[PDB]
Design a protein around this ligand. Structure first.
Ligand SMILES: Cc1cc2nc3c(=O)[nH]c(=O)nc-3n(C[C@H](O)[C@H](O)[C@H](O)COP(=O)(O)O)c2cc1C
Lengths: 239, 48, 79, 145
């Protein structure tokens, strides 16, 4: 015999206290009432399609219930009808993502929602930090993220400057105290505290959000024909 | 055809003195937004 | 040339019995031996490089002039 | 020591990048202006009957109004006007996505598609532009023979 799900509540494992707490508080269901997961929470648990459509058992949390919802509305739904229905439900789906999901909408501010190009370089960074960084550890969950951020600031300075000069970021390690690494710049080019982004500084941000060999982003930057990928990728460790 | 012509011009800032503060700084913000939204368009379009 | 004999005399392991020597149109030969103590597969910990320095004569019968004595630590190569 | 440790001393030096602007006026506080003009102006004008300009643009042999200004006052271009006056001559283009498989996201040639930066532009195009911009010897193909 073997025991997969009987273990994840143990102490030696890395799951977080509250995660163990929920996976405990969820009551199971016998085999007789097993396959009801395709429709409802059966004891606090459900099945969900993957990006490959294949199903997956998962606890019935607000975020994975939202996943379920989008799976019967959005990805079930094909290519062409996808972009426009997103254009429509935008105001709603992002409110959700920011309320009841783990990879939120990037383009939000003090709860105020918006899109990328409505967001300033300064807000961009103050949110990149807010997510890719940990005030508790005062560290970075990873470095492809910190690397991301530095490579962003680099062309920030490329943009607002006039002629060549030396990066205020010569090593991304300077980010290990971020909130200063920004003012060190947004005092060099205060214009960005006000200006929105050039889109040439959006396509970049995104081509980077799609960087192989890097850890995907803990948020959503955009809605496009790739929402599912940005939505249900590397969506396991967070617990 | 002799249809000559003479237009002239003044500096805007000789205008805002015709009005009240609260209305000016109210106008002000309502513009800044524009410049940005305009900045955006100009570039989204300039590219594509 | 003469700017080369200087970068040479610029050196600390390029010592001779008499710097007076004339080093133009001369041909030199370096029969050096190296010793080294490591601390990693690449990062050395001690480096000796010794050996004579010889000179061509109009006969080309080489002869000894000076000595190399290079000492170093924490190197990553042999200069 | 190895450049292993000295590589970091090969400092990173950022080329600038073109951030066109709209040339909106500047707005100074109510002080600088309620002062520059008479205080007697307040409540003294029917604005509905006052006229104003709100926008403007242009086309010519020096492209738009943003760049002509440059050759009008400064006699020569910035890069903010050396690319704009290149985007509108079919010298360069855009591209985001992938080329060489690599994701390029920026300016590029339009006959070769070989990527480019807004720095190697001026040295690369500033010449032909000025040979093909402003007053000139008339070029037939703009006038169908
Ligand atoms: C968190 C988790 C991760 C799993 N990962 C894999 C996997 O990577 N590959 C695989 O073949 N099965 C995987 N499984 C399936 C397990 O091998 C096993 O079938 C399952 O845990 C049994 O469920 P049960 O605890 O209700 O008996 C995983 C199961 C769980 C619960």
């Amino acid at each position: 015999f073997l025991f997969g799900s009987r273990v994840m509540i143990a102490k030696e494992v890395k799951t977080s206290p509250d995660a163990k707490k929920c996976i405990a508080a969820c009551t199971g269901v016998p085999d007789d009432k097993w396959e009801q997961t395709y429709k409802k929470p059966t004891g606090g648990i459900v099945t969900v399609r993957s990006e490959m459509g294949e199903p997956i058992h998962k606890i019935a949390t607000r975020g994975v219930m939202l996943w379920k919802e989008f799976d019967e509305t959005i990805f079930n739904l094909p290519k062409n009808k996808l972009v426009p229905t997103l254009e429509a439900k935008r105001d709603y789906i992002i409110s959700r993502l920011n309320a009841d999901f783990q990879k939120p909408w990037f383009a939000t501010v003090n709860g105020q929602a918006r899109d990328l190009a409505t967001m300033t370089y300064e807000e961009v960074a103050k949110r990149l930090v807010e997510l890719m960084f940990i005030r508790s550890t005062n560290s970075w969950f990873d470095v492809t993220w910190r690397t991301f951020t530095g490579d962003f600031l680099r062309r920030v300075e490329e943009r607002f400057t006039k002629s060549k000069t030396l990066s205020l970021i010569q090593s991304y390690s300077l980010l290990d105290k971020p909130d200063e690494a920004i003012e060190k710049v947004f005092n060099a080019y205060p214009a960005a505290r006000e200006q929105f982004l050039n889109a040439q500084d959006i396509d970049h941000f995104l081509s980077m959000c799609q960087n192989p060999m890097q850890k995907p982003v803990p948020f959503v930057p955009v809605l496009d024909r790739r929402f599912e990928i940005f939505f249900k990728k590397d969506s396991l460790w967070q617990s | 055809g002799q249809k000559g012509g003479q237009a002239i011009v003044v500096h805007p800032d000789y205008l805002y003195g015709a009005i009240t503060e609260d209305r000016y700084n109210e106008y002000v913000a309502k513009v800044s937004a524009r410049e940005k939204s305009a900045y955006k368009f100009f570039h989204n379009g300039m590219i594509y | 040339t003469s700017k080369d004999i200087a970068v040479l005399r610029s050196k600390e392991w390029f010592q001779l019995d008499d710097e007076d020597f004339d080093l133009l149109n001369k041909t030199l030969t370096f029969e050096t031996e190296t010793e080294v103590t490591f601390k990693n597969a690449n990062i050395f910990s001690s480096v000796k490089c010794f050996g004579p320095i010889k000179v061509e004569l109009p006969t080309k019968e080489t002869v000894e002039i000076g000595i190399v004595d290079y000492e170093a630590g924490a190197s990553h190569g042999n200069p | 020591n190895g450049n292993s440790a000295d590589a970091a001393y090969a400092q990173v030096e950022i080329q600038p990048r073109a951030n066109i602007q709209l040339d909106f006026p500047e707005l100074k506080p109510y002080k600088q202006v309620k002062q520059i003009a008479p205080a007697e102006l307040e409540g003294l004008l029917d604005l509905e009957r006052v006229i104003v300009v709100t926008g403007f643009a242009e086309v010519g042999p020096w492209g738009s109004a943003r760049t002509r200004w440059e050759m009008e006052a400064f006699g020569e271009f910035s890069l903010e006007g050396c690319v704009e006056m290149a985007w509108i001559m079919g010298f360069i283009s855009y591209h985001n996505g992938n080329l060489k498989g690599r994701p390029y996201t920026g300016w590029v040639d339009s006959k070769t598609k070989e990527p480019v930066d807004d720095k190697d532009v001026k040295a690369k195009y500033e010449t032909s532009i000025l040979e093909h911009s402003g007053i000139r010897l008339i070029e037939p193909e703009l006038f169908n023979g």
